[PDB]
Design a protein around this ligand. Structure first.
Ligand code: HEM
Ligand code: HEM
Ligand code: A1BU3
Ligand code: A1BU3
Ligand code: H4B
Ligand code: H4B
Ligand code: ZN
Lengths: 418, 418
């Protein structure tokens, strides 16, 4: 009940007392481990499965207690008067409203608790933008544009989150239908192959269905589809000057520019749900900067993504008949030296998987000492290439789900009543 | 209760009904996932925690039923007369003895159930050597030498297991003290650095402590330390002609021979415990062939193993000041093309991590169709380099512990009464 996690590269041993405070569930049982299921039911939020006035006050009290404990005023009168104040509003309104300071704490700790995120050494350096006064899709488009500008910061990227009004009933819901604020379109072809990004082919067509004007090329930035207060979503195009992009070159191979690759600088995921004190925020886009491999390994090289190992190995002229020539591996390392180099030579913030995973080990030390633990998902923390030459491969990690938290939710076009 | 596992590269969906038959536990709970703890208490067997005459007959019946079900004679008279026969012996002797055919089935299914093993497409092609008539360490050394010869098969390797007498009391225990039959010595130095293999430095010194004559070099094959029926273990040196080794060269870089590397062909793990029908076999060395990465990635490049990324990147002349030049990754791929090439050009059976992981996906299809599932540990199945350009990265796997099974046990020098 005071568990032990070893590192097998250092023999360092840490002790996790934080998992005791865990409330949510994991999907594993004593007789089956689901640690490799991608989207377990526990990590998802249906708009039906909200909460009711009863369910709310434990979640509120629980949250308020950890907040006042953290500003060094647990159980005090200022604390207890807030419990009463929320209590009264939860009886009255059946819901309740967070202070600015409570929204900022709750947001930063949903990132801090994000067990699948390797960048968390930065969790308290998060800029929270309060968009809870937003009422229209145009309002949403305005707040999201300012988010992009700020977080992008001319390439010196800054973490940020923009938080639209919380769910209440379930129908009147704020939702960004894009999975990420900046994303490349995906168009299928006559012969069936895919230009652009296969991941977003479904979404690309929903935008065309709502009347988008697709420049049917490769790296076409999708428009935003913003649903405000349950009303049908509306298309807006980010001003291109606001979309920072990196052309991908190589510090040795001159033909790498010929490949004609580029990516956007800002990873800003827009489809997930923030949960603070039992309140659900269905529109909460959040952003930081990339780890190289997310582009260079997954985006570019997943078979069902850009799938470029083909042409890169070609231009390297590689033994491609035999599978055991490791021609796939060989071209994957070059593609990742190129994304790093390109981003750095353009002064756009990026981290390599070695730097980031050492920071996570550092951050894990801090959380275990100053917090009693650090929830971590090994399956997601280990980078998708050169796994075992990074320190996180040899680090045993306890996974458990604390709150405040980020969660998945269905795509709104499967649930929305039009 | 009839769970679903998706593949996210193919959208293939499989259904696991086999996990229902699961008996052992996993270490995870509804509130915490231990899927990345290396040696969980559930995967270990203490020599105290055997079983007693009561505990035995369920385990026997359970095992016997799955055996007779599998030779297409469930619940029959031949089956029921065996249940009675074992029952009687479990009352009489408080233990019992397996048929040859029951030992062979049980062994093959302990491999079949090995959730952390990616080579299992081969599980029914396993040669079982019955060493249950062995009484002395010299007998053990004889059986192990024949195992090496057979399994090595002049380079065309064959899977095999040799099974020494089962535990009974707990003191009179057959144990191979080596962690693997063939392993390279590990000697510390004056300045502290390690020649040989750092992993086995502890074990190397126990052999010297028992009087081994160390040729204090690099790739010195350790002697066997064989404990028979609880008596103190005894040193034997495998005839060198029986130890097949591969010198490691590169199909491009001529300086790769200068590195002066080699590995043994036969991976044969000797320290684990086979568990069949509630009987414990503490000495059961088992072997197949290597996947490249176990040598080329872990053995050669782990910081606390051979740790050669240093010199390889040097001879490639690599940007080594900056961490983000990926010089570590770049040299890891070359080292793995070299292990593959060397093993193949010597006609020694080896598999690359791409070939092996596709086979595992094939094997997983077969087990789900003809067995209702396949227990799998993603943390261990995904290879330690180029993780996400192999199909197992995108395959959700259910982990659960069936029986017959292989298990860890303490090192005998911490438990043995001398
Ligand atoms: C500041 C630099 C950051 C870096 C380098 C980083 C890194 C990563 C990486 C590599 C992943 C894996 C993504 C994938 O595999 O597709 C991830 C996931 C994630 N990140 Fe971070 N991140 C950063 C900032 C943030 C911020 C600011 C937030 C929230 C406000 C956040 C929350 C998350 C969440 C919720 C996940 C997925 C967890 C899940 O599926 O449950 N990250 N991150
Ligand atoms: C025939 C070719 C085989 C291949 C390519 C193979 C491959 C592998 C690999 C790559 C690992 C990971 C080892 C590590 O990461 O250090 C592993 C583990 C393992 N293998 Fe296999 N293996 C083979 C045969 C066998 C046989 C014949 C047995 C048993 C009779 C076996 C049982 C196991 C077990 C028990 C583990 C560890 C599971 C645990 O820790 O619970 N394998 N195997
Ligand atoms: C702030 C941030 C920075 C970064 N550097 N990376 C990030 C990656 C994700 C992320 C989480 C889950 C994802 O996918 C879930 C599969 C679709 C269901 C994806 C996209 N693959 C991204 C994320 F949220 C935030 C990230
Ligand atoms: C038959 C076979 C073939 C192969 N190709 N590979 C194999 C690897 C292991 C294995 C399992 C666990 C291990 O280590 C556990 C850590 C020490 C506690 C190691 C050595 N690292 C090897 C094994 F059993 C059998 C293997
Ligand atoms: C099946 C498996 O759960 C799936 O491929 C996961 C594995 N680990 C991952 N890890 C990260 N960081 N991102 C991912 O998309 C995935 N995908
Ligand atoms: C901490 C973590 O459990 C440990 O590094 C594991 C990870 N996965 C592994 N996978 C394999 N195949 N072999 C290993 O030794 C390990 N080590
Ligand atoms: Zn689990």
């Amino acid at each position: 009940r005071f568990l032990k996690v070893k590192n097998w590269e250092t023999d360092v041993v840490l002790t996790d007392t934080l998992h005791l405070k865990s409330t949510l569930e994991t999907g594993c049982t004593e007789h089956i481990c689901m640690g490799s299921i991608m989207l377990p039911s526990q990590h998802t939020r249906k708009p039906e499965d909200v909460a009711t006035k009863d369910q709310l006050f434990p979640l509120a009290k629980e949250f308020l207690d950890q907040y006042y404990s953290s500003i060094k005023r647990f159980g005090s009168k200022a604390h207890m008067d807030r419990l009463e104040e929320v209590n009264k509003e939860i009886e009255s309104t059946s819901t309740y409203q967070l202070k600015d300071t409570e929204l900022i704490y709750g947001a930063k700790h949903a990132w801090r608790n994000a067990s699948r995120c390797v960048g968390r050494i930065q969790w308290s350096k998060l800029q929270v933008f309060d968009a809870r006064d937003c009422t229209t899709a145009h309002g949403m488009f305005n707040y999201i544009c300012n988010h992009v500008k700020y977080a992008t910061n001319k390439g010196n990227l800054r973490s940020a989150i923009t938080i639209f009004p919380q769910r209440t009933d379930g129908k009147h819901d704020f939702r960004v239908w894009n999975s990420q604020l900046i994303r490349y379109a995906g168009y299928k072809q006559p012969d069936g192959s895919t230009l652009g990004d296969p991941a977003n082919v479904q979404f690309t067509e929903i935008c065309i269905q709502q009347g988008w004007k697709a420049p049917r090329g490769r790296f076409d930035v999708l428009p935003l589809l913003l649903q405000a207060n349950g009303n049908d979503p509306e298309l807006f195009q980010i001003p291109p000057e606001l979309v920072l992009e990196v052309p991908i070159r190589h510090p040795k191979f001159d033909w790498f520019k010929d490949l004609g690759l580029k990516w956007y600088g800002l990873p800003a995921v827009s489809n997930m749900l923030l949960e603070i004190g039992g309140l659900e925020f269905s529109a909460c886009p959040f952003s930081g900067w990339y780890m190289g491999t997310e582009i260079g390994v997954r985006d570019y090289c997943d078979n069902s993504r850009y799938n470029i190992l083909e042409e890169v190995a070609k231009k390297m002229d590689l033994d491609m008949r035999k599978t055991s020539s490791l021609w796939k591996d060989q071209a994957l390392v070059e593609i990742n030296i190129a994304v790093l180099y390109s981003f750095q030579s353009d002064k756009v913030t990026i981290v390599d998987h070695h730097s980031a995973t050492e920071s996570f080990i550092k951050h894990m030390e801090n959380e275990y000492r100053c917090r009693g633990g650090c929830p971590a998902d090994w399956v997601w923390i280990v980078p998708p290439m050169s796994g075992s030459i990074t320190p996180v491969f040899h680090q045993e990690m306890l996974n458990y789900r604390l709150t405040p938290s980020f969660e998945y939710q269905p795509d709104p076009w499967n649930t929305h009543v039009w």
